[PDB]
Structure formats: structure tokens, C-alpha cells
Design a protein around this nucleic acid. Structure first.
Lengths: 229, 56, 115, 122, 119
RNA sequence: CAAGGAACUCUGCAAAUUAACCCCGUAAGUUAGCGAGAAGGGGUGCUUAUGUAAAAGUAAGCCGCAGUGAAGAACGAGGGG
RNA sequence: AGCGAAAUUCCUAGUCGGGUAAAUUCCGUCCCGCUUGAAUGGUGUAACCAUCUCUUGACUGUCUCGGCUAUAGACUCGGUG
RNA sequence: ACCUCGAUGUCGACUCAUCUCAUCCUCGAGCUGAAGCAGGUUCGAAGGGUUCGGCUGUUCGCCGAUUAAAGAGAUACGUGAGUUGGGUUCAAACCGUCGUGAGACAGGUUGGUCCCUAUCUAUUGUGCCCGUAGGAAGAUUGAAGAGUGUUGCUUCUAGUACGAGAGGACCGAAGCGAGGACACCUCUUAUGCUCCAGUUGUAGCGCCAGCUGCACCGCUGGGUAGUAACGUGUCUAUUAGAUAAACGCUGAAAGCAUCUAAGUGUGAAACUAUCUCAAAGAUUAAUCUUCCCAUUUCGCAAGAAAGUAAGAGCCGUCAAAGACGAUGACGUUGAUAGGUUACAGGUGUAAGCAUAGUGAUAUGUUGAGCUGAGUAAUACUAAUUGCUCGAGGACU
């Protein structure tokens, strides 16, 4: 199925009361109209994708190769360049606006880098039960568990590859699927997305067309206060 | 815990290939000779203006 | 690209009112709850003291605590939730922004009141 | 949070004074006794002028949770004690009267007949 | 593991911060570890900014952040502050002090640095 | 450290609540000495006033979430070998 | 004589009653007690127990299921080793 | 008794599990003395799930409550350089027995040492150097991979097929949940040791008040940010191909028949993709993009005076990162950090003043005062007036 896409940065989180007397936690994403840097059909490079530019910056804060590439095709000098698969409907030099890409209440997936917490221990990484603390505890009482699969000459005689063990955690591209967009703001280039999005504010945020829902539309509506003293 | 077979001298000489410091930066102060480290004060007690300290 | 990180309230501004009175914890208020069971829109009455006043903009939440027939009841309200009418009945001397004494304080002891 | 082997007070005319939840129903290790579920209980202390005595086990419905849960309506509810209503293994209960306010979120799971005999609903 | 020295707990840290800022106010230049001086400059400029009001409330507030030295007593230090410290720092908002990087120490080889007052 | 309160574990092991002051109250059994601080409850701050030698003691008034505000002061009950 | 599935019982996880949502542990009672049992003492016995065990009240991060803070250590830089 | 005695550490639970299929569940199919529900048995299918307690030291087992079920095993009857010692296996003692006695008993009971800073492999991440067709910056390709791939309940179809009545669906749809995975901090909590309020004991600021130092952060109630969860959102699937058991179509040997030999299909949570993640050290070291160099004259233009302009490194300021290394943002066109101003947020009426009151205290200035991280503007201070690597296309 055809998949549209857009880029932006999360700036905050709030909640919005919707219809049927309930709420919805919302994140607010500030996107900026972009320039289509390139489109590649499957007859030129065999991968039909679209390279887009975002986070526009001045020219005197960019290296020679990227600025030369940008001025070659008469595009804005931009900071970030990234590709999105399966999108060919647009063309060079066209701007992309979120209001002209989706409907009021369709489903779109989101992706962003993870909020790394450093060299996170095994327990937090895989939710392993802590050892007993009373009736004696030994030297360790917080460890990944025995990775042994068998002693002897040839039963295991090896620590199996890919066993869940402490190490780097976070700072890895993660995604959230099946989320509903509610509100738009054209005067500030602002969008509202239900749920929570991984990654701290200031990082890269990508919104793509959902795959588990191939683009089905079901409306979502919010109420308006009408009470005055 | 200890090793089974003793590590040879060439294993040691291979291991220490990375335990080597990175050299510092030489700098010539505008109002002091005796070339110094970059981004610090000089030996003549200066920093290009500001005679903030003596040489003692 | 440059942002204020305050647009959260800039979009929150549209879902506010002026009906909501300014009030703090330690006062007795009675609110009305609108309930919709697809028909017969029902109006409730809920009286009690305010426990806390936290949050800003649309995140302002507060608590109502009441004691009926020996059973305590506690409810939490988002201020700008739809169909929430709130009025001030009685206010007294406030001491703390959030109060933690409503479980061992009973009647026959004069609760503080001011002008 | 009302976990395994938890004391709670009876809230109906069953002849008991103190009841204890022993095993939750539903799925394994669900460790939850939130409003609207059905749970196995065992009466601890019973006095005359009632209908049932200690020793036997029953299936009841929990009503009061001290911690309280955030409802899907945007409002949070809290309690200062935990209580349950004894039923006779069907929709209709053994209880004839209810002490204190009860919840309403259990309306979708039935039991409106029991809900109809409470002093007030919050 | 077992019993050890109390270390660099928060109370000790703030006490040393106040001692260092009082000393640098009394004399003017202080050589020490770079990180500690950088941390203490916050409190230093806080006190300097709050001292320009020249009111008894400000005196009472800054009293609990100053410890006397051999050169000046607490009253002497406050008199010096009201005499020749405030008026110079009215035409320049914030950043009254500067910090520069000294060479490494002989024994510990940690980055020494000087902190001084300026226009 | 929310809610639960012994449900993990061989075992309430280890930890936590009761602590001092004075005032009530304290059973079966008992070699009548004990059991016993049994158990189970009250309050202790401040100001003024009354008093005896000062105190100890009492009345009135003040406030907080808390008044041996800090620290140092006992977990019991019952049934057995 | 007294006592008794007693830490003495292999059969036995003996019977039964009680405490329990459920008791190979506990209390009491039932005797064909392998080989109980009297100065290798037998039987109760008030108070004592860093004695062992059983039930229970409150209180408990032991636990449901973990979480945060501070330090010292650890860890990079220097010296020694 | 063939390896082990100049060491092969045995029971049990805890954490982590992995693997096989004689399948406990979910899946499909046949048969049936299967009206339906509900069964009984057999056939393929191991991706996933496979509960909590009381008893004894525990597997064995009993019992209780339940679950779609509460699998059968192995891995030194898995894992003491991972804990725990309850049992077994120490020196003490008791009781029964045995023995004339030292003493013993697969008889019973109470107490009681559990060490090791990791060299390599393996593994978890992580870097420095070189490498790829001259050198940089990038954007992709996905070869070979990994992770994820449980499901329950109620309602509708419907009291419909069926059966007589009673009773009571296969096939699909909707919502509500519980396990476990991914993140988030708007609400709710926990935490929050340079925050706010209150307050005791003391030592000082000569003294009243107000302060700091200490007393578990002195104590108690809150709370910025960050941080997490008991909290909130999503995931649990839809589908395609080839299929296993099966069911077929037509059609043969041997004019019939036949699901099979040819040809052709339908067909299971399994297999390969659609889901997510990483990925050219993928030597098959891949494609494309841009930027720069090829500069008269000297053995192999070989370093011959110009050794990139492209960029990177040294050093500095920092957290969206962070054990160091790395990543990311910026180094005077400069907002990178610390300031100053503005505000949010938290606390809750600052001190002093006036005044009622015998006096604690109360009342108005005062929703003021204060503030660690927060959101911004502002060159105020620090990032300085710097140094180094870095080119003549190697092979058609």
C-alpha cells in the first residue's frame, strides 16, 4: 500500500477531552513545511522512495558537500536529509503540509530514537525477578540469572548467543503503531497525536502511514465548553 | 581466578598497543615565551591582557 | 525551527472558560455532575472539601472528599472536563496548598472560617 | 490493589463481620481485584441473627477499593476501605441491603439489581 | 562497604562552597579545582547580585552565606562589601567574575584553575 | 515507599511498631513470694493565673499534621515438650 | 503402680475430635506398649528461659512486583603498587 | 567397574531457562452404537501458552481454590568460581535398641565453617587501527540475520439448523478483559540530601527577633526537574505463496474402478514474506549523490620548491548522550554552557511595620516573600589573539 510520511519534533504533552465523556492524552508535534529533495522510482534505482529535507538552517553553518548538493538542484540549504520508502506522488521542489496529507481521524504510525539511559542493568532491560533478600543474600542479589545450558563435554559447553544480558539500552530507533490523530493547527504548523511518543524533545520524529491499518478512517471528535458564570 | 597456560611476552606486547597517551598542544603566547598548553594560562602569569598572577 | 516550548498552552487556550471560580483547598464546595445514559440527562450534587490544587492550564486537577453514613468518599476532577459546574459555598482560613487532615478530623470541632 | 489473602469488611446483611479474599478469578496471576470483578471469598467471623456462618466459601463481587482506579471517563474515584457483596452464584445476590455508597462503573457488567438497593451512588 | 569517612556529602559540599565564596570575596583570587570553582561562581554571582540593594533584608539574607577570614571579620567583610564591591557592579549585569585554567598540580595532576573578579 | 499484611522461605530469620514521665486499670493459676510494667487505656508543647521553699500540682487561654515534637529509653497473648 | 503413636511407633502419612478455603507440623483422647515403665527414677508441679515447637492480635519492603535518593566503593585522570 | 582419587562438590527450592514430541491447551482432519450441546479414539502440527497455596527438607504425594490446560522428559537426575544449608556428612547431647564394655544403629530428636580481584574461549554491549580500487561527506540496496508471533469472557447472527419436547451450534461480527513486549510522563502515585512551610535541643552572630553549625537529610508535611510504575497508549493480528494429515477433478495399468503415475486444485496457529530491529569486515568489502585534487622542471612525478582547497583530529563549552571511548549541539556571522531579566511550576502570607490583646498569638501591607535542574530573551563570563593530519588515481 502507498505510504505517505512527514517529519517533525515533539515539543510537549497535554490532554484533550473528546466526545462520549472521556479524555485522550495527546502529544503535540511541531512540523515545518519541507522541500522534496528527491524521488526515486523503481526504474531508476530499483527502490521507489522519497528523500526529504527538514530542520532548515542558514547557509553559513553547513559544510561544502551538502551545501553544494543543495544548490545543485536549487533547493533550500537544510540540515537533515532522510529517505522514506514507498512514496512517489510528489515531485521536486514541492512543499508538504500535514493538512494536505491525511484526514481528520485516520491511523498513522510514529517513529523516533529512544531516550537512552546509559549502560542500563539487566533487570530493567528484560524485567528479571530479583533474588531473595532475607534468609541470606550472598554477595549479589541483582543479576541476570544463570545463563548455563548444561555442563559436561558436549551438552552445552557454551554460553548461547543472543541471551538477554545487561548492556546498552535506549538511543535506538523505536516505533509506535496504531495511533489516531485528532487536531491540527495551520496558523502554527502544529499537529496533535494521541498517545505517547518515545524520544526526548528536540530529537527527530517521523510520522508514517500505518500498515496494520492500511489507511482506514474513523472520525474522532472533541467537545467544546459552553459554560459561563 | 588465574590462567592455565602462562601468557607469553608477545601477548603482553600486543595488548599494550593501545595504552599510549595522546600528545598535548604547543602554544605561543602573545606576551609570553616558554611555549605552553592550549586553553590555559601561561608561565609568565598572563593570558593575553590580564597579568593575573606572578611567576611565583 | 526556533520554538518556545510553550505552544502546549497556546493550543490549550481554546478549551478554557471564565465560569470556574478561583479557589484553594480547605473550603466547602458543591458541584454538579451531568450523567448521560443515552437519555434522561441526570444532574448530581456532590459536596465536600477541596484537598489539592495542582497543575496548570488543562492539567489543573482537584479533589472533593465527603463523609456519608460513616463511609468516606473521594473524587478527582479535571477542572475543564465537560459538563462540570462548580461553585463556592463556604471558604475559611487556609493553611497549606494541599491538606492531609481529613481522616481523623470529625464534627463537634469548629472548622475554621473567615470573613 | 487488593491482592492475595486480603481482609475486607462485609457491606450487606449476611451475618458476618469480617471477610477475607483468598483467590481471584479470571486468568492466572492477574493479582487484580478492581471494581466489577467476581472473586472467591471466605467468611472469617460470623454472629447470630444471620443466614450463613464461618467455614464455608462463597463467590462475591468487590465494590470498595481503597487505592481506587482511574475510570475511562476522565474522573478518578477513591475509597477509604474495601468491601464486597455476597451473591448466590447468580446475577441476584444474597444481600438485601447495602451499607454506604457504591460504584457505578459495574453497570456494563450487569448487577444493576444490586446497584438499585444502595443508599447513594458516586 | 564497611565504616568509612563521611566523604563529600551535600552538607560538606555547600559548607565548602560558602567558605570558598567568602574567601574569594575577602581576597579576590582563588586557585582550586576547576569544577568546584565553576560550581561556586553561581553562588558568588547570586550573592553579588543580591548585595546591590543595600537594605537590611539583603544584609540578613547574605549573612547566612558569609564566613569571616583573618583579614576581615563578618562585620568588616559586610562593611567592605557595602563600601567598594557594590558600586562597581552596577553598570555590568551578571558575570562579575571570570575563571581561567591553570596548569596541572604536581602530585595529583588534576586541572587547577583560578577564579577572580573583574569589571 | 502507594494497596495488601506472613501470602516467598524449613521457621514472623532478619527488619519495623510498643519505649521515658506520671494517672487508671490488670484475669486464670499459684510452693502465695509471684504471675505483673500483665493485658488494655489517659495525657506530657506553649502563655497567663493559683499555690508550697522553689518546685512538683491545678484552672483559664494559643497554635500546628505532630506537643517526653530532635536523639537516647520493652512488641505481646495463648497452648505444650 | 503411674504414663503413653511420648524427640522411644517399623508397620503408620495409626483412628477420631479441634484449630484450617485445605494440616506427613501442633493440642487432646483411643492401647496387642516390636523393645514403655520406676532411683540408667516414674508422675504432675508455681515462677525462669539469647531452649525447641504450635496458633494468634497489632506492625512490618520478607512478598504480590519492584522503584528512587544519597554517599563510600566501583569507574576514567595522577602517584605508588 | 573402562575413565576421575598430587579433588569429578551430591538432595531441595530461587533466577534464567533451552531443547525433543509418545500433544495439556489453542489448530486442522477422519471414524464413531456422533439428533445438537457434549463426547471417545486416532491422524499431522513443538511458534506460543503450560496457576496459586496448606503439609513435611523436597522432588514423590495428599488436599484446597481455580484455568483453554494446570503436558511427558532430558540438559553432570541443568546451573554452590549465582545465592540460600532446610536435609545429607563432621566433632556435642538425648531417648529406643544392639553390645558385659569402649561404641554403634538405612531408629527418632535440638545446635552448628559454603572461599576465590577472570588469562583465553563463549557471551553482553562497546570502542582504536587498517581495509574497500584517489580522498571526504552523505543517501540507499538487504546477502546472511535477530526479536515478535497466548488468548479468555459477554453480546449479535439466534432460540435460528437440529431434535418432539427439553435442550441447544458449526461459520462470521462487536465490545470488554487478563498474561507478556514496546515507550511516556497529561492525570495518579513512589522518589526527590544546595527547594518551601512548621518546629525541639543546644554554640555563636555582644543583646530581643531573625539566622547558620550539628543532632538518621535533626525531625514532620509538601513539592521543581529528572526518574520510574501500581498509572496511560499501542502491540496479541489481516494477508500471500508453497505445504503436512486429509478431501478432490478428470484419467490410466488390467476398456471397470481409482486423489496419482502425467496434468490440475482446495487445504493447519507450523515453513517463507507481509510486523519490528540492526546490517557492505556482505572479501559477492555493493549502487548513487555531491565536494576537492591531477599545477612548467629532477632516478620508480620517485616526495621536487607548492604536500587539498574537501574534511578531520588536538583543546574548549555542554546534554537529547555519557563508565572512558564514542553520539549529538556549538566554538565570536557566535545563544553551547554559567550568569542577569520575564514567566511557569512548588511552598504558602517573608522580614520589618501598624495594631488588638496581661501573653503566647491574631489581624492589614501580604496571594507577598523565597526558590536545584524548567520555559525563554540577553553577549554579561567562559568557549581566545591557535596547532596538527590532509593532493598528483594506485591495477585493463
Amino acid at each position: 500500500m502507498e505510504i505517505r510520511g512527514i517529519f517533525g519534533v515533539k515539543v510537549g504533552m497535554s490532554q484533550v477531552f473528546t466526545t462520549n465523556n472521556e479524555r485522550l492524552p495527546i502529544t503535540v508535534i511541531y512540523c515545518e513545511p519541507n522541500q522534496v529533495a528527491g524521488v526515486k522510482t523503481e526504474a531508476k534505482d530499483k527502490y521507489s522512495a522519497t528523500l526529504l529535507s527538514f530542520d532548515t538552517v542558514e547557509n553559513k553553518k553547513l559544510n561544502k558537500p551538502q551545501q553544494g548538493f543543495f544548490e545543485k538542484n536549487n533547493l533550500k540549504p537544510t540540515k537533515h536529509l532522510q529517505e522514506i520508502r514507498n512514496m512517489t506522488g510528489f515531485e521536486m521542489g514541492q512543499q508538504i503540509t500535514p493538512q494536505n496529507l491525511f484526514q481528520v481521524g485516520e491511523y498513522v504510525d510514529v517513529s523516533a530514537i529512544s531516550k537512552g539511559r546509559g549502560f542500563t542493568g539487566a533487570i530493567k532491560r528484560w524485567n528479571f525477578k530479583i533474588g531473595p533478600l532475607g534468609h541470606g543474600a550472598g554477595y549479589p542479589h541483582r543479576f541476570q540469572g544463570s545463563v548455563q545450558a548444561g555442563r559436561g563435554g558436549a551438552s552445552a559447553q557454551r554460553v548461547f548467543k543472543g541471551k538477554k544480558m545487561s548492556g546498552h539500552y535506549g538511543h535506538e530507533k523505536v516505533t509506535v503503531q496504531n495511533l489516531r490523530i485528532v487536531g491540527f493547527d495551520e496558523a502554527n504548523m502544529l499537529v496533535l497525536v494521541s498517545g505517547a511518543i518515545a524520544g526526548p524533545e528536540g530529537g527527530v520524529v517521523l510520522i508514517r502511514t500505518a500498515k496494520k491499518k492500511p489507511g482506514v478512517v474513523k472520525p474522532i471528535e472533541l467537545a467544546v465548553q459552553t459554560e459561563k458564570a | 581466578a588465574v590462567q592455565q597456560r602462562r601468557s607469553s611476552k608477545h601477548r603482553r606486547d600486543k595488548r599494550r598497543s593501545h595504552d599510549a597517551l595522546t600528545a598535548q598542544a604547543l602554544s605561543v603566547c602573545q606576551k609570553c615565551g616558554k611555549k605552553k598548553l592550549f586553553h590555559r594560562v601561561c608561565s609568565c602569569g598572563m593570558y593575553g591582557d590580564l597579568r593575573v598572577k606572578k611567576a611565583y | 525551527k526556533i520554538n518556545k516550548q510553550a505552544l502546549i498552552d497556546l493550543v490549550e487556550q481554546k478549551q478554557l472558560k471564565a465560569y470556574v471560580p478561583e479557589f484553594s483547598a480547605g473550603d466547602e464546595v458543591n458541584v454538579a455532575i451531568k450523567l448521560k445514559e443515552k437519555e434522561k440527562v441526570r444532574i448530581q450534587n456532590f459536596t465536600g472539601t477541596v484537598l489539592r490544587r495542582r497543575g496548570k492550564g488543562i492539567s489543573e486537577t482537584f479533589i472533593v472528599r465527603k463523609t456519608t453514613d460513616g463511609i468516606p468518599i473521594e473524587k478527582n476532577f479535571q477542572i475543564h472536563n465537560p459538563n462540570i459546574s462548580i461553585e463556592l459555598k463556604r471558604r475559611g482560613k487556609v493553611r497549606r496548598a494541599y491538606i492531609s487532615y481529613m481522616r481523623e478530623r470529625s464534627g463537634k470541632a469548629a472548622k475554621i472560617k473567615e470573613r | 490493589m487488593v491482592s492475595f489473602m486480603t481482609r475486607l469488611n462485609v457491606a450487606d446483611n449476611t451475618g458476618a463481620k469480617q471477610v477475607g479474599i483468598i483467590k481471584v478469578l479470571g486468568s492466572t496471576r492477574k493479582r487484580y481485584a478492581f471494581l466489577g470483578d467476581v472473586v472467591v471469598v471466605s467468611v472469617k467471623d460470623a454472629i447470630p441473627s444471620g443466614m450463613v456462618k464461618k467455614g464455608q466459601v462463597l463467590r462475591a463481587v468487590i465494590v470498595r477499593t481503597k487505592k481506587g482506579q482511574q475510570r475511562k471517563d476522565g474522573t478518578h474515584l477513591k475509597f477509604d476501605d474495601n468491601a464486597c457483596v455476597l451473591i448466590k452464584e447468580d446475577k441476584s445476590p444474597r444481600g438485601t441491603r447495602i451499607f454506604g455508597p457504591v460504584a457505578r462503573e459495574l453497570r456494563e457488567r450487569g448487577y444493576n439489581k444490586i446497584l438499585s438497593l444502595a443508599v447513594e451512588v458516586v | 562497604s564497611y565504616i568509612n569517612k563521611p566523604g563529600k556529602t551535600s552538607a560538606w559540599r555547600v559548607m565548602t562552597v560558602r567558605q570558598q565564596v567568602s574567601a574569594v570575596l575577602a581576597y579576590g583570587k582563588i586557585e582550586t579545582t576547576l569544577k568546584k570553582a565553576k560550581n561556586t561562581q553561581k553562588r558568588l554571582d547570586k550573592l553579588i547580585t543580591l548585595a546591590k540593594v543595600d537594605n537590611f533584608n539583603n544584609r540578613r539574607q547574605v549573612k547566612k552565606w558569609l564566613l569571616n577570614t583573618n583579614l576581615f571579620d563578618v562585620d568588616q567583610l559586610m562593611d567592605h562589601l557595602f563600601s567598594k564591591v557594590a558600586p562597581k557592579y552596577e553598570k555590568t549585569p551578571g558575570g562579575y567574575s571570570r575563571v581561567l585554567k591553570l596548569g596541572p598540580r604536581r602530585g595529583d595532576a588534576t586541572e587547577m584553575a583560578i577564579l577572580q573578579l573583574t569589571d
